[PDB]
Amino acid sequence: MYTREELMEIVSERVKKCTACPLHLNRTNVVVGEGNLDTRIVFVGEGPGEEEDKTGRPFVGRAGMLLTELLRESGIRREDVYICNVVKCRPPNNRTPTPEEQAACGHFLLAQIEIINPDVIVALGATALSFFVDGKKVSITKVRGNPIDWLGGKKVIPTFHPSYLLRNRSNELRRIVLEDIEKAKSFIKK
């Protein structure tokens, strides 16, 4: 009938045609998401930066290369998981997407999670976290590392966005994010 791959391609073609928010006027390429459609763990960030926009691929700039290393140090190959964002189009000057933009784009993310049907989601940063708590503004610093019970018994573990760890190179902060990723892994089923 229809495979996960075909469903994801339908999402991708709809994203490419999307003009539901002002971000479509700014982006060079939409950035849908990448990796393993049978992952039990999905990583979700905010939205594309410059290198993402140029390539159509998520987490390929500086924050993304850091993410690759966090995953490696957590025993995870990027190819084996799925990585995406709340918004699909790069905002002008890489500004934070507005709540209205996040709301317009969010149905695509919900569709990607429905297709993959993971056990656990790692929400990287405040925008991603907001998505999984009905759009509420909530401090990542205050709630990071605490699992959230989301739809269908899926667990969401919020942590810092890798951008933050670009600016603050402390070992303690890195160890905290690695502990959050390991807590995420512990919710993947047998």
Ligand code: SF4
């Ligand atoms: S950011 Fe999302 S809702 Fe906005 S135009 Fe791009 S694909 Fe559409």
